[PDB]
Design a protein around this ligand. Structure first.
Ligand SMILES: O=S([O-])[O-]
Length: 292
């Protein structure tokens, strides 16, 4: 009956399907809700959503009103203790050896599997959640359905094959474009037949490309389509006002996509519930730029 999870800080034994789950990280609520586990607490990340559950996942709450935790002054260890959980899911929470001891003193705790304390590969997060809440087979079909949905996009748009994409943050950082590097977070673009432009590779800092101002134009001009994870029309305005972005062929040839807030959220969550939103709402935008 008992499930043993192996993670970065040891092993956690879950004796039976959990009844009172805390979602301690930024995104685990999506994968829990997907297998009909409503958390007694969800942790806010951004967007000021009600109960920190974004629209694609909100229906699964079934009217439930979880406590909303935050990481503004670290993990709210005392609030977690007061919720009396029987499982703490803390995969995307910045857990370290010390906070893991604090969480484990309250309840069986599932930490991240590796060197990413935040935003480990989404499928490894989804499979761990699936094991922990005794829904591994259901979670397997939900992962498969995301891959199927993006493959279906590719089947409808064979002309996209080998076109070059970049996935950028919705805001400059201290004057720099910030690109998502090729890795798990860009697999959904490869799934639709695109490639990630290699112009960002020399500018790596951990999992992102921080583009010096004197390289912004040449790096953006390598791509056929640019997806900016803007969260507001003000974000788009500030990107198009940047003198290097403004002077680029990406701007002259209208190769930019500026996401709605919901689409930015859906990419940011990269979950079994959020990726379908991306598969539905991004392709028609790409089609405007590359042609169907
Ligand atoms: O982790 S594999 O499923 O991409």
């Amino acid at each position: 009956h008992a499930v043993t999870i192996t993670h970065l800080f040891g092993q956690t034994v879950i004796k039976e399907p959990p009844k009172r789950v805390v979602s301690a990280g930024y995104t685990e609520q999506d994968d829990l809700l997907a297998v009909d586990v409503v958390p007694i607490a969800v942790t806010d990340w951004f967007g000021d959503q009600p109960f920190a559950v974004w629209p694609w996942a909100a229906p699964k709450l079934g009217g439930a009103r979880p406590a909303v935790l935050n990481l503004d002054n670290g993990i709210q260890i005392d609030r977690i203790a007061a919720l009396k959980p029987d499982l703490i899911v803390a995969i995307n929470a910045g857990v370290d050896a010390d906070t893991y001891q604090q969480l484990s003193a309250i309840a069986p705790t599932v930490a991240q599997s590796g060197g990413d304390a935040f935003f480990e590969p989404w499928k490894d997060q989804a499979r761990s959640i699936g094991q922990a809440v005794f829904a591994a087979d259901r979670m397997r079909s939900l992962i498969e359905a995301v891959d199927q949905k993006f493959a279906a996009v590719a089947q409808r748009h064979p002309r996209w094959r080998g076109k070059k994409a970049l996935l950028l943050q919705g805001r400059l950082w201290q004057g720099n474009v910030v690109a998502t590097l090729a890795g798990w977070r860009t697999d959904f673009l490869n799934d639709m037949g695109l490639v990630i432009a290699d112009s960002i590779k020399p500018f790596a800092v951990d999992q992102r490309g921080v583009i010096p101002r004197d390289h912004i134009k040449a790096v953006l001009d390598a791509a056929d389509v640019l997806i900016w994870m803007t969260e507001s029309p003000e974000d788009e305005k500030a990107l198009l006002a940047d003198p290097e972005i403004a002077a680029s062929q990406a701007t002259a040839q209208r190769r930019h996509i500026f996401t709605s807030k919901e689409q930015a959220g859906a990419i940011a969550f990269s979950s079994v519930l959020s990726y379908p939103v991306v598969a539905e709402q991004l392709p028609p935008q790409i089609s405007q730029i590359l042609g169907a």
